[PDB]
Amino acid sequence: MPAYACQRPTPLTHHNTGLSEALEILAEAAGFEGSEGRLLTFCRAASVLKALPSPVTTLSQLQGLPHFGEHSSRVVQELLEHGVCEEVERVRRSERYQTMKLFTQIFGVGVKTADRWYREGLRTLDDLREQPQKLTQQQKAGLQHHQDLSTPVLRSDVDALQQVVEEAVGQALPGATVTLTGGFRRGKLQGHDVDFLITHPKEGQEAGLLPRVMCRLQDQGLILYHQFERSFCIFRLPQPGSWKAVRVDLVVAPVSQFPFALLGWTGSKLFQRELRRFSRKEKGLWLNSHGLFDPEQKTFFQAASEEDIFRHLGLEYLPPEQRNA
DNA sequence: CGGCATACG
DNA sequence: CGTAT
DNA sequence: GCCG
Ligand SMILES: [Mg+2]
Ligand SMILES: [Mg+2]
Ligand SMILES: [Mg+2]
Ligand SMILES: [Mn+2]
């Protein structure tokens, strides 16, 4: 089992679901406390389990797995022995975890904001509603739409939004294309948002494109909230006899950078962090969603596909559905 | 012990 | 500070 | 929290 998540296939569904879910609770809790290093290790350990070809049934099977030391091993041992890990349950129950989770779920609210509210004694969404002078306009949007935004988006919904985005993109810049990215591209059947990457086969034609797109969507009455290269929107999505609010991200990249932006926006988030860490630490190359830089020759790699990028970095190619780290 | 991904709004 | 993978 |  290789040490970096980008060195191994990680399928969407796997054989250690409960074990990985428990470690991810501890990862999430570490994040709420600002402990990025611990969050990372628990994320990585959970990910290793996702990559295994069968269930872990005995403690000895963790021997030699990367990212399993005393703490993560003890968590797994308790689950294997008792079906429950006391630490994990204590986290789930805690007022601090439940409130930070509730608050950070709000669009416009991050760990730092949630934590300050927690410290001020706020606990519920209605606490926030009953003091709206303290909220940014983004936070007000996130709070108004919070219920709809907590409902899973389905693949059927995604096909509907794509047609709608293509229509606007087509008027804004004929020839421009729209590609579905994020979790849906990795094969997820549900999600909490939809991500699209927009480009044009003629380098440079995509300059200034996003505002033209947004103006047209807004003119069609489809935008409940927004507001460059990235747009984080709330869209109005038709439902039988009604509609619901859905988070949609729109991103534009020039065609030269498209493989890099596709790779970055397809995720998973942990996969991309690991891929960038691998690039920098193992290959001495600097990767981002725009390109891949050799800081010794001071040159950028041209890529025509994601395949090219995996080859540049000396990694076996993984399709999106195996990037579910 | 240092490091932990790397952007844009 | 927020957002994204 | 763990790796190198
Ligand atoms: Mg939030
Ligand atoms: Mg997404
Ligand atoms: Mg997501
Ligand atoms: Mn998104």
mmCIF file of C-alpha atoms (C1' of nucleotides) and ligand atoms in Angstrom:
data_model
loop_
_atom_site.group_PDB
_atom_site.id
_atom_site.type_symbol
_atom_site.label_atom_id
_atom_site.label_comp_id
_atom_site.label_asym_id
_atom_site.label_seq_id
_atom_site.Cartn_x
_atom_site.Cartn_y
_atom_site.Cartn_z
ATOM 1 C CA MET A 1 0.000 0.000 0.000
ATOM 2 C CA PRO A 2 1.694 3.233 -1.189
ATOM 3 C CA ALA A 3 1.858 6.196 1.172
ATOM 4 C CA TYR A 4 0.193 8.854 -1.045
ATOM 5 C CA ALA A 5 -3.480 8.580 -2.034
ATOM 6 C CA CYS A 6 -2.667 9.501 -5.641
ATOM 7 C CA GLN A 7 -0.579 6.348 -5.926
ATOM 8 C CA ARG A 8 -3.492 3.967 -5.509
ATOM 9 C CA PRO A 9 -7.050 3.465 -6.884
ATOM 10 C CA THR A 10 -9.742 4.496 -4.433
ATOM 11 C CA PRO A 11 -13.215 3.476 -5.597
ATOM 12 C CA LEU A 12 -16.425 5.265 -4.644
ATOM 13 C CA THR A 13 -17.725 2.349 -2.638
ATOM 14 C CA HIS A 14 -15.518 -0.022 -0.677
ATOM 15 C CA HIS A 15 -15.164 -2.664 2.053
ATOM 16 C CA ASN A 16 -14.443 -0.625 5.161
ATOM 17 C CA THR A 17 -17.173 1.938 5.202
ATOM 18 C CA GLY A 18 -17.827 2.053 8.936
ATOM 19 C CA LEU A 19 -14.146 2.208 9.867
ATOM 20 C CA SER A 20 -13.461 5.035 7.407
ATOM 21 C CA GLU A 21 -16.544 6.951 8.567
ATOM 22 C CA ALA A 22 -15.363 6.873 12.189
ATOM 23 C CA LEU A 23 -11.885 8.170 11.320
ATOM 24 C CA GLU A 24 -13.459 10.926 9.250
ATOM 25 C CA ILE A 25 -15.466 12.061 12.289
ATOM 26 C CA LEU A 26 -12.193 12.494 14.146
ATOM 27 C CA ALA A 27 -10.727 14.277 11.097
ATOM 28 C CA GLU A 28 -13.668 16.663 11.009
ATOM 29 C CA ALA A 29 -13.436 17.300 14.757
ATOM 30 C CA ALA A 30 -9.718 18.080 14.492
ATOM 31 C CA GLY A 31 -10.557 20.634 11.819
ATOM 32 C CA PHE A 32 -13.142 22.299 14.016
ATOM 33 C CA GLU A 33 -10.319 22.751 16.547
ATOM 34 C CA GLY A 34 -7.909 24.164 13.980
ATOM 35 C CA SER A 35 -5.681 21.131 14.071
ATOM 36 C CA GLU A 36 -4.867 20.692 10.346
ATOM 37 C CA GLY A 37 -2.118 18.128 10.856
ATOM 38 C CA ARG A 38 -4.297 15.740 12.834
ATOM 39 C CA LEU A 39 -7.213 16.294 10.371
ATOM 40 C CA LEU A 40 -4.867 15.331 7.585
ATOM 41 C CA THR A 41 -3.619 12.159 9.249
ATOM 42 C CA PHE A 42 -7.113 10.936 10.109
ATOM 43 C CA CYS A 43 -8.261 11.751 6.526
ATOM 44 C CA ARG A 44 -5.312 9.808 5.149
ATOM 45 C CA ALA A 45 -5.868 6.850 7.412
ATOM 46 C CA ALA A 46 -9.544 6.709 6.471
ATOM 47 C CA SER A 47 -8.520 6.883 2.818
ATOM 48 C CA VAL A 48 -6.122 3.957 3.123
ATOM 49 C CA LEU A 49 -9.032 1.833 4.317
ATOM 50 C CA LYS A 50 -11.096 2.880 1.316
ATOM 51 C CA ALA A 51 -8.315 1.544 -0.916
ATOM 52 C CA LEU A 52 -8.155 -1.955 0.647
ATOM 53 C CA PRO A 53 -9.466 -4.903 -1.371
ATOM 54 C CA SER A 54 -11.484 -6.430 1.507
ATOM 55 C CA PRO A 55 -12.733 -5.751 5.047
ATOM 56 C CA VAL A 56 -10.300 -5.295 7.917
ATOM 57 C CA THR A 57 -11.419 -7.913 10.451
ATOM 58 C CA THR A 58 -8.408 -8.170 12.751
ATOM 59 C CA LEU A 59 -6.015 -5.664 14.224
ATOM 60 C CA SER A 60 -3.018 -7.406 12.658
ATOM 61 C CA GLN A 61 -4.207 -6.385 9.194
ATOM 62 C CA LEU A 62 -3.218 -2.749 9.995
ATOM 63 C CA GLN A 63 0.460 -3.724 10.347
ATOM 64 C CA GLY A 64 2.487 -1.983 7.678
ATOM 65 C CA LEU A 65 -0.351 0.248 6.464
ATOM 66 C CA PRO A 66 0.737 3.876 6.165
ATOM 67 C CA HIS A 67 -0.941 6.460 8.406
ATOM 68 C CA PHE A 68 -1.918 3.958 11.073
ATOM 69 C CA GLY A 69 -0.110 4.640 14.345
ATOM 70 C CA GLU A 70 -1.222 4.297 17.953
ATOM 71 C CA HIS A 71 -4.281 6.526 17.731
ATOM 72 C CA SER A 72 -5.934 5.396 14.462
ATOM 73 C CA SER A 73 -5.146 1.779 15.270
ATOM 74 C CA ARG A 74 -6.809 2.053 18.658
ATOM 75 C CA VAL A 75 -9.905 3.554 17.013
ATOM 76 C CA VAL A 76 -10.132 0.584 14.633
ATOM 77 C CA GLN A 77 -9.442 -1.929 17.423
ATOM 78 C CA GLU A 78 -12.367 -0.577 19.492
ATOM 79 C CA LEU A 79 -14.709 -0.737 16.527
ATOM 80 C CA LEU A 80 -13.607 -4.302 15.688
ATOM 81 C CA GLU A 81 -14.008 -5.435 19.310
ATOM 82 C CA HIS A 82 -17.149 -3.537 20.404
ATOM 83 C CA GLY A 83 -18.713 -2.099 17.267
ATOM 84 C CA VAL A 84 -18.189 1.399 18.640
ATOM 85 C CA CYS A 85 -15.249 3.692 19.515
ATOM 86 C CA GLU A 86 -15.769 5.643 22.744
ATOM 87 C CA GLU A 87 -13.841 8.698 21.525
ATOM 88 C CA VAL A 88 -15.801 8.840 18.309
ATOM 89 C CA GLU A 89 -19.120 8.602 20.138
ATOM 90 C CA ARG A 90 -18.068 11.255 22.598
ATOM 91 C CA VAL A 91 -17.294 13.590 19.697
ATOM 92 C CA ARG A 92 -20.621 12.906 17.957
ATOM 93 C CA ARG A 93 -22.558 13.688 21.144
ATOM 94 C CA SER A 94 -20.682 16.820 22.025
ATOM 95 C CA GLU A 95 -22.316 20.223 21.845
ATOM 96 C CA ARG A 96 -19.142 21.629 20.347
ATOM 97 C CA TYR A 97 -19.014 19.147 17.461
ATOM 98 C CA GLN A 98 -22.719 19.351 16.673
ATOM 99 C CA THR A 99 -22.801 23.138 16.709
ATOM 100 C CA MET A 100 -19.613 23.619 14.676
ATOM 101 C CA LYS A 101 -20.926 21.112 12.143
ATOM 102 C CA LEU A 102 -24.271 22.915 11.933
ATOM 103 C CA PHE A 103 -22.670 26.341 11.600
ATOM 104 C CA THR A 104 -19.885 25.430 9.120
ATOM 105 C CA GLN A 105 -22.532 23.803 6.904
ATOM 106 C CA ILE A 106 -23.881 27.263 6.226
ATOM 107 C CA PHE A 107 -22.706 28.750 2.920
ATOM 108 C CA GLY A 108 -20.658 31.798 3.937
ATOM 109 C CA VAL A 109 -19.622 30.413 7.323
ATOM 110 C CA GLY A 110 -16.201 28.879 7.945
ATOM 111 C CA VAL A 111 -14.477 27.328 10.944
ATOM 112 C CA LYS A 112 -13.271 30.705 12.256
ATOM 113 C CA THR A 113 -16.719 32.296 12.056
ATOM 114 C CA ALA A 114 -18.487 29.231 13.531
ATOM 115 C CA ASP A 115 -16.007 29.118 16.421
ATOM 116 C CA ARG A 116 -16.505 32.820 17.298
ATOM 117 C CA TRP A 117 -20.310 32.352 17.258
ATOM 118 C CA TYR A 118 -19.888 29.245 19.443
ATOM 119 C CA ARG A 119 -17.818 31.273 21.889
ATOM 120 C CA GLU A 120 -20.430 34.038 21.923
ATOM 121 C CA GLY A 121 -22.862 31.333 23.017
ATOM 122 C CA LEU A 122 -24.862 30.899 19.795
ATOM 123 C CA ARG A 123 -26.057 27.334 19.175
ATOM 124 C CA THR A 124 -28.885 27.180 16.605
ATOM 125 C CA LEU A 125 -29.820 28.513 13.174
ATOM 126 C CA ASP A 126 -32.601 30.570 14.767
ATOM 127 C CA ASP A 127 -30.009 32.150 17.054
ATOM 128 C CA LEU A 128 -28.389 33.426 13.897
ATOM 129 C CA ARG A 129 -31.638 34.496 12.273
ATOM 130 C CA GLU A 130 -32.554 36.588 15.352
ATOM 131 C CA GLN A 131 -29.522 38.900 14.853
ATOM 132 C CA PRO A 132 -29.151 39.359 11.099
ATOM 133 C CA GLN A 133 -27.167 42.575 11.418
ATOM 134 C CA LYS A 134 -24.214 40.367 12.314
ATOM 135 C CA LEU A 135 -24.476 38.381 9.032
ATOM 136 C CA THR A 136 -22.783 39.051 5.715
ATOM 137 C CA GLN A 137 -25.025 39.060 2.616
ATOM 138 C CA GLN A 138 -23.451 35.722 1.640
ATOM 139 C CA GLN A 139 -24.301 34.340 5.061
ATOM 140 C CA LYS A 140 -27.843 35.644 4.838
ATOM 141 C CA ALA A 141 -28.231 33.775 1.540
ATOM 142 C CA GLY A 142 -26.737 30.625 3.003
ATOM 143 C CA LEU A 143 -29.071 30.838 5.979
ATOM 144 C CA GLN A 144 -32.263 31.512 3.961
ATOM 145 C CA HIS A 145 -31.473 28.658 1.621
ATOM 146 C CA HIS A 146 -29.988 26.335 4.215
ATOM 147 C CA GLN A 147 -32.805 23.802 4.223
ATOM 148 C CA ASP A 148 -32.840 23.293 0.437
ATOM 149 C CA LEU A 149 -29.046 23.242 0.389
ATOM 150 C CA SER A 150 -29.057 20.371 2.906
ATOM 151 C CA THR A 151 -31.137 18.187 0.607
ATOM 152 C CA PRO A 152 -29.052 15.941 -1.687
ATOM 153 C CA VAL A 153 -28.866 16.894 -5.338
ATOM 154 C CA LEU A 154 -29.538 13.918 -7.677
ATOM 155 C CA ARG A 155 -27.945 12.939 -10.987
ATOM 156 C CA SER A 156 -31.311 13.737 -12.678
ATOM 157 C CA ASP A 157 -31.069 17.226 -11.288
ATOM 158 C CA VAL A 158 -27.552 17.538 -12.681
ATOM 159 C CA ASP A 159 -28.606 16.774 -16.259
ATOM 160 C CA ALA A 160 -31.273 19.474 -15.994
ATOM 161 C CA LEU A 161 -28.809 22.143 -14.770
ATOM 162 C CA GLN A 162 -26.237 21.224 -17.411
ATOM 163 C CA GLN A 163 -28.666 21.914 -20.249
ATOM 164 C CA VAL A 164 -29.561 25.200 -18.715
ATOM 165 C CA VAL A 165 -25.894 26.199 -18.265
ATOM 166 C CA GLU A 166 -25.060 25.128 -21.843
ATOM 167 C CA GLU A 167 -27.820 27.344 -23.221
ATOM 168 C CA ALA A 168 -26.472 30.411 -21.459
ATOM 169 C CA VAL A 169 -22.845 29.546 -22.311
ATOM 170 C CA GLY A 170 -23.840 29.075 -25.971
ATOM 171 C CA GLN A 171 -25.233 32.629 -26.173
ATOM 172 C CA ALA A 172 -22.392 34.085 -24.229
ATOM 173 C CA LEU A 173 -19.736 32.531 -26.466
ATOM 174 C CA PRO A 174 -20.660 30.187 -29.314
ATOM 175 C CA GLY A 175 -18.386 27.159 -29.374
ATOM 176 C CA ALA A 176 -17.726 27.228 -25.624
ATOM 177 C CA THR A 177 -18.125 23.863 -23.867
ATOM 178 C CA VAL A 178 -19.372 22.802 -20.458
ATOM 179 C CA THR A 179 -17.901 19.849 -18.597
ATOM 180 C CA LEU A 180 -19.351 18.269 -15.435
ATOM 181 C CA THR A 181 -16.665 18.006 -12.732
ATOM 182 C CA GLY A 182 -16.521 17.463 -8.965
ATOM 183 C CA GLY A 183 -18.093 14.471 -7.239
ATOM 184 C CA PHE A 184 -20.546 13.695 -10.036
ATOM 185 C CA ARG A 185 -17.669 13.193 -12.438
ATOM 186 C CA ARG A 186 -16.153 10.675 -9.971
ATOM 187 C CA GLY A 187 -19.409 8.729 -10.216
ATOM 188 C CA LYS A 188 -21.368 9.947 -7.224
ATOM 189 C CA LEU A 189 -25.110 9.449 -7.546
ATOM 190 C CA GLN A 190 -25.879 12.344 -5.187
ATOM 191 C CA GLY A 191 -24.123 15.489 -4.079
ATOM 192 C CA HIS A 192 -24.560 18.757 -2.232
ATOM 193 C CA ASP A 193 -23.545 20.908 -5.178
ATOM 194 C CA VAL A 194 -22.849 20.666 -8.904
ATOM 195 C CA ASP A 195 -19.548 21.745 -10.470
ATOM 196 C CA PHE A 196 -18.981 22.777 -14.100
ATOM 197 C CA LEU A 197 -15.844 23.696 -15.977
ATOM 198 C CA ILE A 198 -16.226 25.925 -19.040
ATOM 199 C CA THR A 199 -13.697 26.500 -21.824
ATOM 200 C CA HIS A 200 -13.396 27.293 -25.553
ATOM 201 C CA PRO A 201 -11.195 25.472 -28.086
ATOM 202 C CA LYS A 202 -9.677 28.754 -29.272
ATOM 203 C CA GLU A 203 -7.145 29.987 -26.701
ATOM 204 C CA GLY A 204 -8.082 33.412 -25.396
ATOM 205 C CA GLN A 205 -11.739 33.342 -26.513
ATOM 206 C CA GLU A 206 -12.742 32.479 -22.966
ATOM 207 C CA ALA A 207 -11.460 35.799 -21.535
ATOM 208 C CA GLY A 208 -14.372 37.735 -19.989
ATOM 209 C CA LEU A 209 -16.720 34.825 -20.378
ATOM 210 C CA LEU A 210 -18.049 34.284 -16.871
ATOM 211 C CA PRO A 211 -19.748 37.673 -16.414
ATOM 212 C CA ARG A 212 -21.500 37.180 -19.735
ATOM 213 C CA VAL A 213 -22.707 33.796 -18.581
ATOM 214 C CA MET A 214 -23.867 35.046 -15.191
ATOM 215 C CA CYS A 215 -25.768 37.960 -16.720
ATOM 216 C CA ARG A 216 -27.642 35.590 -18.996
ATOM 217 C CA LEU A 217 -28.487 33.124 -16.248
ATOM 218 C CA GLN A 218 -29.622 36.037 -14.077
ATOM 219 C CA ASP A 219 -31.772 37.348 -16.939
ATOM 220 C CA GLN A 220 -33.456 33.973 -17.178
ATOM 221 C CA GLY A 221 -34.476 34.230 -13.497
ATOM 222 C CA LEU A 222 -32.337 31.199 -12.582
ATOM 223 C CA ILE A 223 -29.983 32.767 -10.069
ATOM 224 C CA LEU A 224 -31.141 33.051 -6.440
ATOM 225 C CA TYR A 225 -27.656 34.174 -5.338
ATOM 226 C CA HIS A 226 -24.186 35.004 -6.667
ATOM 227 C CA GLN A 227 -21.216 37.392 -6.426
ATOM 228 C CA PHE A 228 -13.527 36.631 -12.546
ATOM 229 C CA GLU A 229 -12.812 32.872 -13.075
ATOM 230 C CA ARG A 230 -15.024 31.138 -10.450
ATOM 231 C CA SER A 231 -18.688 31.777 -9.562
ATOM 232 C CA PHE A 232 -20.303 30.226 -6.504
ATOM 233 C CA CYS A 233 -24.038 30.408 -7.261
ATOM 234 C CA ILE A 234 -27.332 29.307 -5.797
ATOM 235 C CA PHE A 235 -29.597 28.299 -8.707
ATOM 236 C CA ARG A 236 -33.311 27.782 -8.888
ATOM 237 C CA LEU A 237 -33.929 24.195 -9.917
ATOM 238 C CA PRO A 238 -37.374 23.076 -11.151
ATOM 239 C CA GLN A 239 -39.191 20.507 -9.050
ATOM 240 C CA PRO A 240 -42.695 19.109 -9.660
ATOM 241 C CA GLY A 241 -45.052 22.068 -9.139
ATOM 242 C CA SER A 242 -42.292 24.028 -7.456
ATOM 243 C CA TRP A 243 -38.490 24.379 -7.307
ATOM 244 C CA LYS A 244 -35.538 24.134 -4.931
ATOM 245 C CA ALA A 245 -32.317 26.071 -4.373
ATOM 246 C CA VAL A 246 -29.137 24.217 -5.454
ATOM 247 C CA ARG A 247 -25.464 25.227 -5.137
ATOM 248 C CA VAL A 248 -23.667 25.328 -8.508
ATOM 249 C CA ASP A 249 -20.069 26.310 -9.121
ATOM 250 C CA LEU A 250 -19.030 27.678 -12.520
ATOM 251 C CA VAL A 251 -15.388 27.859 -13.431
ATOM 252 C CA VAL A 252 -13.676 29.043 -16.614
ATOM 253 C CA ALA A 253 -10.221 28.056 -17.835
ATOM 254 C CA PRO A 254 -8.360 28.679 -21.071
ATOM 255 C CA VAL A 255 -8.004 25.508 -23.172
ATOM 256 C CA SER A 256 -4.219 25.338 -22.492
ATOM 257 C CA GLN A 257 -4.991 24.989 -18.795
ATOM 258 C CA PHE A 258 -8.121 22.837 -19.168
ATOM 259 C CA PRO A 259 -6.490 19.483 -18.234
ATOM 260 C CA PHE A 260 -5.116 20.987 -15.073
ATOM 261 C CA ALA A 261 -8.397 22.635 -14.142
ATOM 262 C CA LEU A 262 -10.333 19.441 -14.946
ATOM 263 C CA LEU A 263 -7.952 17.422 -12.786
ATOM 264 C CA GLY A 264 -8.143 19.890 -9.893
ATOM 265 C CA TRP A 265 -11.938 20.355 -9.999
ATOM 266 C CA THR A 266 -12.612 16.603 -10.260
ATOM 267 C CA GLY A 267 -11.030 15.956 -6.895
ATOM 268 C CA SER A 268 -11.465 14.429 -4.463
ATOM 269 C CA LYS A 269 -10.152 17.200 -2.253
ATOM 270 C CA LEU A 270 -7.865 14.748 -0.460
ATOM 271 C CA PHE A 271 -6.770 13.252 -3.795
ATOM 272 C CA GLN A 272 -5.722 16.741 -5.053
ATOM 273 C CA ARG A 273 -3.866 17.648 -1.825
ATOM 274 C CA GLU A 274 -1.999 14.333 -1.997
ATOM 275 C CA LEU A 275 -1.286 14.760 -5.701
ATOM 276 C CA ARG A 276 0.163 18.231 -5.123
ATOM 277 C CA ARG A 277 2.159 17.037 -2.114
ATOM 278 C CA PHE A 278 3.498 14.143 -4.198
ATOM 279 C CA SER A 279 4.366 16.422 -7.080
ATOM 280 C CA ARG A 280 6.309 18.826 -4.870
ATOM 281 C CA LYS A 281 7.923 16.439 -2.379
ATOM 282 C CA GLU A 282 8.695 13.461 -4.635
ATOM 283 C CA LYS A 283 9.162 15.035 -8.113
ATOM 284 C CA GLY A 284 10.144 18.609 -7.235
ATOM 285 C CA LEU A 285 7.382 19.963 -9.490
ATOM 286 C CA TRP A 286 4.728 22.535 -8.417
ATOM 287 C CA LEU A 287 1.160 21.594 -9.325
ATOM 288 C CA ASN A 288 -1.990 23.676 -9.222
ATOM 289 C CA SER A 289 -5.274 23.915 -11.105
ATOM 290 C CA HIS A 290 -3.609 26.106 -13.764
ATOM 291 C CA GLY A 291 -0.446 24.142 -14.533
ATOM 292 C CA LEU A 292 2.634 22.239 -13.451
ATOM 293 C CA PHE A 293 5.872 24.145 -12.988
ATOM 294 C CA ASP A 294 9.465 22.948 -13.022
ATOM 295 C CA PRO A 295 11.134 25.479 -10.706
ATOM 296 C CA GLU A 296 14.605 24.354 -11.803
ATOM 297 C CA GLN A 297 14.140 24.990 -15.530
ATOM 298 C CA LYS A 298 11.540 27.687 -14.808
ATOM 299 C CA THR A 299 9.182 26.108 -17.359
ATOM 300 C CA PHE A 300 5.500 24.990 -17.375
ATOM 301 C CA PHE A 301 4.505 21.568 -18.710
ATOM 302 C CA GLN A 302 2.021 21.614 -21.533
ATOM 303 C CA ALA A 303 -0.698 19.057 -21.061
ATOM 304 C CA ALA A 304 -3.320 18.006 -23.589
ATOM 305 C CA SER A 305 -5.100 15.615 -21.198
ATOM 306 C CA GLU A 306 -5.209 14.415 -17.635
ATOM 307 C CA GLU A 307 -3.362 11.373 -18.965
ATOM 308 C CA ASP A 308 -0.434 13.703 -19.836
ATOM 309 C CA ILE A 309 -0.347 15.041 -16.282
ATOM 310 C CA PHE A 310 -0.221 11.624 -14.595
ATOM 311 C CA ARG A 311 2.586 10.737 -17.038
ATOM 312 C CA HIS A 312 4.524 14.011 -16.284
ATOM 313 C CA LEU A 313 4.396 13.058 -12.598
ATOM 314 C CA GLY A 314 5.345 9.397 -13.139
ATOM 315 C CA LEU A 315 2.103 7.988 -11.685
ATOM 316 C CA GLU A 316 -0.114 5.291 -13.153
ATOM 317 C CA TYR A 317 -3.252 6.904 -14.670
ATOM 318 C CA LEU A 318 -6.426 6.794 -12.471
ATOM 319 C CA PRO A 319 -9.789 7.530 -13.996
ATOM 320 C CA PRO A 320 -12.082 9.923 -11.997
ATOM 321 C CA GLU A 321 -13.999 7.040 -10.472
ATOM 322 C CA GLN A 322 -10.765 5.813 -8.822
ATOM 323 C CA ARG A 323 -9.879 9.225 -7.353
ATOM 324 C CA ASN A 324 -12.315 8.916 -4.469
ATOM 325 C CA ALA A 325 -9.668 9.286 -1.795
ATOM 326 C "C1'" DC B 1 11.745 17.963 14.299
ATOM 327 C "C1'" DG B 2 9.277 20.247 9.922
ATOM 328 C "C1'" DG B 3 5.684 19.546 7.200
ATOM 329 C "C1'" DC B 4 1.156 18.997 6.092
ATOM 330 C "C1'" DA B 5 -1.951 21.924 -1.348
ATOM 331 C "C1'" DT B 6 -2.994 25.485 -3.543
ATOM 332 C "C1'" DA B 7 -5.661 28.419 -5.548
ATOM 333 C "C1'" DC B 8 -9.689 32.449 -6.384
ATOM 334 C "C1'" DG B 9 -13.897 36.005 -4.502
ATOM 335 C "C1'" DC C 1 -12.640 36.350 6.173
ATOM 336 C "C1'" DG C 2 -15.264 33.415 2.636
ATOM 337 C "C1'" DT C 3 -15.213 29.874 -1.473
ATOM 338 C "C1'" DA C 4 -13.482 25.465 -4.350
ATOM 339 C "C1'" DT C 5 -11.430 20.531 -5.524
ATOM 340 C "C1'" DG D 1 -1.161 12.192 14.000
ATOM 341 C "C1'" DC D 2 1.867 10.467 11.504
ATOM 342 C "C1'" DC D 3 6.104 10.078 8.049
ATOM 343 C "C1'" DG D 4 10.550 10.607 6.567
HETATM 344 MG MG MG E 1 -19.675 27.027 5.281
HETATM 345 MG MG MG E 2 -18.827 19.469 -5.694
HETATM 346 MG MG MG E 3 -18.317 18.074 -1.718
HETATM 347 MN MN MN E 4 -18.701 22.783 -5.917
#
